[PDB]
Amino acid sequence: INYLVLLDQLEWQRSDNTNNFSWSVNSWIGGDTDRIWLKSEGERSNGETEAAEAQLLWGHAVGPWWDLVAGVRQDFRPASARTWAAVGFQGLALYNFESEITGFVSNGGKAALRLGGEYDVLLTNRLILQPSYEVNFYSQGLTDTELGLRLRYEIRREFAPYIGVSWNQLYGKTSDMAKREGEKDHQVVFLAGARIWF
Ligand SMILES: CCCCCCCCOCCOCCOCCOCCO
Ligand SMILES: CCCCCCCCCCCC[N+](C)(C)[O-]
């Protein structure tokens, strides 16, 4: 009936001797009370997609801005794949906020939880500063946090180039493995990209 295509982040990322193209896409299709969400979010470098993740979710409205979502998450790595059942809650109001809390369950008793949010701070009607956060837990369990700041200029409302920074931290076993591989367990990542929706 209607739809929204929101390519929320299409961005090249630069940190310590790393470089990738990353994406975060969060789109939906349907009616006023029920919709199908298509989410996708991933990284590639050197023509090799290092990692990709997709979710297909039924969203049922529970109030003016919030949906209950239930569906499937599919993770891809070059030599492996993993399927999760997903259930959570998703809020979205364009030019205001997005917020999500989703749990995931997979075969081997594996569970995960993701918290995320962003909100728009209008500097002008077209220059918009967007702080964001994402928190990931895994249990077989806090694994990682990303605190972002993206400054976009809406040329068109449909094409908004931006620059930004993300403060990324690892925790616990993920942090210990990072250090064991000779790497810091935190990064400042620099971003250039575009936000596109229609
Ligand atoms: C509030 C905005 C913070 C601005 C931080 C500075 C961003 C500077 O970098 C912008 C251009 O670079 C972005 C990432 O680079 C792409 C990765 O590959 C490039 C290879 O050089
Ligand atoms: C279970 C997740 C909790 C999310 C908290 C939601 C905030 C409640 C108020 C925002 C809007 C609620 N509303 C109006 C959609 O019903």
Author numbering: 90 to 229, 239 to 296
The authors write:
Various transport systems are present to maintain intracellular Cu homeostasis, including the prokaryotic plasmid‐encoded multiprotein pco operon, which is generally assigned as a defense mechanism against elevated Cu concentrations. 23 While PcoA is a periplasmic multicopper oxidase, distantly related to CueO, PcoB resides in the outer membrane and has an elusive function. Here we structurally and functionally characterize the outer membrane component of the Pco system, PcoB, recovering a 2.0 Å structure, revealing a classical β‐barrel architecture. Aggregated, our findings indicate that PcoB serves to permit Cu import.
In contrast, N‐terminally truncated PcoB, PcoBΔ27−81, a form that does not alter the Cu‐binding properties, successfully yielded crystals in the presence of the detergent C8E4, which diffracted to 2.0 Å. Instead, the structure was determined using single‐wavelength anomalous diffraction (SAD) based on SeMet‐data and refined to R/Rfree = 0.22/0.26. The structure discloses a classical β‐barrel, formed by 12 antiparallel strands that span the outer membrane in vivo. However, the architecture of the PcoB barrel is flattened as a consequence of intra‐barrel contacts between charged amino acids, thus restricting the width, whereas these interactions of OmpLA are caused by hydrophobicity. Strikingly, a 12 × 18 Å wide cavity is present on the extracellular side (top right), as established by condensed loops between strands in the region leaving the aperture uncovered. From this region, a funnel‐like pore is penetrating almost the entire barrel, becoming narrower towards the periplasm, with a remarkably electronegative funnel surface throughout (bottom right). Along the pore, multiple negatively charged‐paired residues are present, in particular: E130‐E223 towards the extracellular side, D97‐E207 and N115‐Q179 towards the periplasm, which are both placed perpendicular to E187. The E130‐E223 and D97‐E207 pairs are both highly conserved among PcoB proteins, and form interacting carboxylic acid‐carboxylate hydrogen bonds that assist in flattening the barrel, and at the same time lines the pore. However, the structure was obtained in Cu‐free conditions, and consequently there are no indications of the metal in the pore. In contrast to the extracellular side, the waterline of the pore becomes partially obstructed at the intersection between D97, E187, D209 and E207, with D209 and the adjacent Y184, being in proximity to the periplasm and yet capping the pathway together with L183.
